[PDB]
């Protein structure tokens, strides 16, 4: 809601504008009376460890121009770092972490740390943020025998996210879910973000990763656009598509079958976020249902 | 940058009238150490019955640059919800027996009450941070007897300190978690006692509706309890039951660990300002004898 | 401290449409040096006739973190006051002949107009600092001919720089003072020119009601004057008289000192933003020429 | 008008408070609704060169609690230092500087310097201050033959001072006056401050000096109170009341003849001002009508 452009906000806004067209684009967003949620942004765990300042800076820009994102982040790399320090190797199937009781302890502790890290970086920039670490995702077991403490999300409770935004604070969420009776269950961040998007139907849906999209492994070329109805089935049969990419793309396809056809998902690097959000950039991989 | 209005400064002056009161305030106003001003436990009933006065008093503390650690309960509204759905509340030794359905009600109630308090504060211009999990680590108190109830074994200070450092009042629930991530129900008086133990605040305050503890055998409010002299005999009295017994027990165990200079005030919210700014306690004061 | 509202940012965006314009704004927005963005001379009449527009335009500049040096006149208010007293205004070569009584009137009017503008700015949330003396030191221009009229010999920058450093728009009169403290009257166009000479600002703007200079022999507004080619011929034209003649000469002598990249814009307040943010001038532009 | 207590303002207020009586004294000023000007404060020129931080700091306290003083400063000592360096002996009669053309140029320069020094120190503390160096005092020649460029003040134009206060800025004045036709005339700062106090009829009238009051030259002791109706005539016959002190005492006597008997004037060091204004300390020299 609250628009308050600091010196850094003004510089961020102007520094890459070069045309009337770009100016007009920003004017359209700043004069908008829409009540639609602006954005759900999924943040790769690696970005919080490697690229915190940059992440905090673009989130701060959005905050200062009154366009609050719902932010959901992962924690995969730092979990593997802790397990390795303890002489334990991680285990996945279908891109999903097999999560026994000891692994869940590490996952929970790492999520809390990395969540607070991001919230604090934001507060150090004068951006109000709330760590939302429980009470959003209710889940049952995806498959206890196979994955152990891994959740299948059944419902999203919106009130803590909306209360945060209403209070003027960015809601910063982990992908942890809970059963009704309170057993925490690990969920993949790509999946949890998609559930948020499903229920909020935001203007913008963004997945931030380091590669800045999805890279065709046979050619090495970045895939600019994916038309799911045409390309999904045979894209998934390609042997270069890694488990994590397969999980990501499956979730997005399911998400976009629910959302209206006007919705889309951008998979992009954080340095290209502003131009993709505001000035209609072709950076990253854009994914839509299509025909 | 901190600033205070005329009304805030006037109310501040109205609370301070001696050199030691001034010094106490300024000591905590400009945080020169990791020392904490207050742990304030809020009875759940206050959030449903007297929220505006609770929020206003906490908002005054914030506006004079003080950041109490606030932890609230939710027992009465859990009891309300259960009775509303035709389920009778289930306690033993003052502790709620918490099966799988009861825990879902407790969690949802905790979160609702928490957001209610946080939002009332925000509406008064107070930055408040919900801290609903991640502080209390527990194992099962007694599975067979209480089911999903915790016995706290550690307090993680970071989220509370981070909140204060960001200039927001931390508003905590008493939910705890096992290492493996099973949330457990903990009595809010007990949890508050665990916070006081690790933070060693200047002030330890429990807010209830009665404004202290009443002696059942006489019908008179108890002004002071000297534990070393009175605890053993007091716990034998048959009028001392349920939640009260549990409250006195935890406070006794807390004050055994804290220095003799510490004390615990059980008061009504209308006595909070006087209890925090002066040594002339109100309600029921408890100290080591 | 700095923050900008939505409507401030919207208005900034409406003023910028090229990369060059962005880099120009950013250069002056982020400056930690003594470089100056603008000297803006305000015609006295505008304070009587169109104050709110003037004050709003200056407020926008302040709200985007730009700190123009503002110097204003008061000629027409003085003439009205003299005529209210049954005194005929007395000019030669565009300069007011200023005896003791007239100096009292000029001083009072100047201080009044100054406080009028400063207060209008403050009402819009703009910090503005009256600077009514201590800037211009002067000798007598010609005591027999003009009486209490000054020829400016130095400009003290300190009061203006301190205002800007504190985040306040400096609002100046053109009153000057002898070393020993006799105030001397100076034409506001000339004093503004002296300010431009020592500050060498990016932008030199003269605000008048006509939005430039009209060629008397055609009735057409002059869009551009290239002084090297046109100045001698122009000053021989019979329609070039009084205050307009003085203004042109003063601008010419100013531009003899400044680099060829400089220019002076004589415009109406409605064109101030365009003139400040873009290279597409308005009204009457004056330069040396290439 | 605008009350806004900063961190340092709160500490400044409470630091010295030990009793309920002191508290109630501050409550009286903070709950007040009277339209009367709070204070006229004369600042000896030396304080601006010698103890500027401390001066800026107590003025800042008054600003932040919404009790704006009208501030008038001198510059006598630094003019003498300038003259000294040019090989010129300072020239005084009856505590008033004889001021020829050269000396007026020094006085003027050096007034503007001290004025801007004070204004800038206030602004650095986040206090809005407006330099008011002309347009307040209109004067005739005091005695051209005897004093040269020295003024006798005939009127005080209030508008600039009231406009500054209304805008939220402390008005910081020099004592320079001007004739109708614009010859600047030098006026002693003690006299100009008296002329301000006459027309503003403030609640408090304070003269700040480094000595911290007036010293009885014969006994070698600070004078705490002067009852003028009783003491004035004999005081003016004492050998140790000459130069500025004589001028000051006479100007204060004439001021308190015009003002009601409830008014008084304090002469004090800046370190004792807060306690003097708010909690009736009895430091420095208090002067009043008496009987
Ligand atoms: C179930 C599962 O795979 N959880 C992910 C969540 C963290 C993330 O996505 O970065 C994990 O790595 O444990
Ligand atoms: C274990 C237990 O009794 N917990 C409390 C928590 C709420 C409170 O203390 O207000 C309960 O009523 O469930
Ligand atoms: C000397 C001289 O002509 N001064 C001008 C100054 C006012 C103005 O320029 O608006 C005058 O009118 O007296
Ligand atoms: C006339 C006169 O004596 N003026 C004083 C003004 C400065 C002051 O009072 O400090 C002077 O010393 O010149
Ligand atoms: Cl960005
Ligand atoms: Cl860990
Ligand atoms: Cl209240
Ligand atoms: Cl419920
Ligand atoms: Cl509920
Ligand atoms: Cl306008
Ligand atoms: Cl000097
Ligand atoms: Hg960890
Ligand atoms: Hg509930
Ligand atoms: Hg309180
Ligand atoms: Hg305008
Ligand atoms: Hg006039
Ligand atoms: Hg000097
Ligand atoms: Hg003071």
Author numbering:
A (entry chain A), D (entry chain C): 62 to 352
B (entry chain B): 63 to 351
C (entry chain D): 63 to 352
Quote the paper.
The first step of the route is the production of N-acetyl-L-glutamate (NAG), while the second is the phosphorylation of NAG by NAG kinase (NAGK). We report here structural and functional studies on the arginine-sensitive NAGK from Saccharomyces cerevisiae (yNAGK). The structure of the mature yNAGK, lacking the N-terminal mitochondrial targeting sequence (residues 1–57), reveals an unexpected novel tetrameric architecture, which can be described as a dimer of dimers with D2 symmetry. The AAK domains occupy the center of the molecule flanked by two pairs of interacting DUF619 domains.
A truncated form of yNAGK spanning from residue 58 to 356, corresponding to the AAK domain and lacking the C-terminal DUF619 domain, was produced as a soluble protein in milligram amounts in E. coli. In the crystals containing NAG, one NAG molecule was found in each subunit. As reported in other NAGKs (best studied in EcNAGK), NAG is bound in a pocket in the N-lobe under the closed lid formed by the β3–β4 hairpin. Despite the different oligomerization of yNAGK in relation to other NAGKs, the AAK domain structure closely conforms to the canonic α3β8α4 sandwich NAGK subunit fold, with the N-lobe spanning residues 96–272 and the C-lobe residues 273–350. In yNAGK, the β5 strands of the two subunits still interact with each other, although they are parallel due to the large rotation of one subunit relative to the other. At each interdimeric junction, a four-helix bundle is formed by both interacting “stands”, burying an approximate area of 910 Å2 per subunit.
